[PDB]
Amino acid sequence: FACKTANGTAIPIGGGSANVYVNLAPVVNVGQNLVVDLSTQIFCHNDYPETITDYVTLQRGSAYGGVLSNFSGTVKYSGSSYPFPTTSETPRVVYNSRTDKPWPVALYLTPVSSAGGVAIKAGSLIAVLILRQTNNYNSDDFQFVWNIYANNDVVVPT
Ligand SMILES: C/C(=C\[C@H]1O[C@H](CO)[C@@H](O)[C@H](O)[C@@H]1O)c1ccc(-c2ccccc2)cc1
């Protein structure tokens, strides 16, 4: 089991860490979500599906900088919404193919009343997401840690 970003940044067997750089809608108003769709950014596969099935959760996710300050968040895992920053581990997604498939995570961030002006700075950390991989074969239990960065400012009009 290993993962990679869309631009090819890999985390190998055993887990590790990588940075992910995302484009964000530049203007977001109150009552709208800023969507950060990581299912187009992070992909994983099973290296031995003949014999092993892998299980993958979002073990935890945290918000940083302008994201935590200026927005109310949820994370959708396989299309289902949970609190973000997280307070528990998600259900487990089955990875049973050597063909890469997305990690099905997306953040939905809606402005709170104190948002106004530059709500997310270009270059800033928006989230750290911990992908946990186990399997049905042995005790392997590995963490793939993704630091998510904004490619551009996001402004909330006032
Ligand atoms: C590829 C592999 C393990 C990796 O790939 C597995 C499948 O994705 C993961 O579940 C593991 O955590 C690890 O990332 C592997 C496991 C067992 C054997 C094996 C084969 C014959 C006899 C004993 C063990 C070979 C490869």
Numbering used by the authors: 1 to 158
What does the study report here?
The adherence of UPEC to the urothelial surface is mediated through the mannose-specific lectin FimH, the natural ligand of which is the mannosylated glycoprotein uroplakin Ia present on urothelial cells. Mannose-based FimH antagonists compete with this interaction and prevent bacterial adhesion and hence infection. Here, the first crystal structures of C-glycosidically linked α-d-mannopyranosides in complex with the FimH adhesin of uropathogenic E. coli J96 are reported. Two ligands are decorated with a para-biphenyl group on a C-linkage to an ethene spacer (CcbP) or to an ethene with a branched methyl spacer (CtbP) and one with a naphthyl group on a C-linkage to an ethyl spacer (CN).
After several cycles of isotropic temperature-factor refinement, we solved the three-dimensional structure of the FimH–CtbP complex with one molecule in the asymmetric unit. CtbP is bound to the N-terminal region of FimH with the mannose ring tightly bound in a hydrophilic pocket able to stabilize the sugar moiety. Indeed, multiple hydrogen bonds are formed to amino acids such as Asn46, Asn135 and Asp140 and also water molecules. Owing to the trans stereochemistry of the 1E ethene group, the biphenyl part of the ligand accommodates the closed tyrosine gate formed by Tyr48 (χ1 = −164.0°, χ2 = −169.2°) and Tyr137. Moreover, the hydrophobic biphenyl moiety also interacts with the lipophilic amino acids Pro26 and Val27 of a neighbouring FimH molecule because of the crystal packing. Despite the hydrophobic pattern of CtbP, this ligand is solvated with well structured water molecules (average B factor of 18.5 Å2) on its solvent-exposed side. CtbP (trans) and CcbP (cis) can accommodate both open and closed conformations of the tyrosine gate formed by Tyr48 and Tyr137. We found that the linker-associated water molecule is shifted away from the C-glycosidic linkages compared with the O- and N-glycosidic linkages and that another water molecule could come in to assist in hydrogen bonding downstream of the C-glycosidic bond.
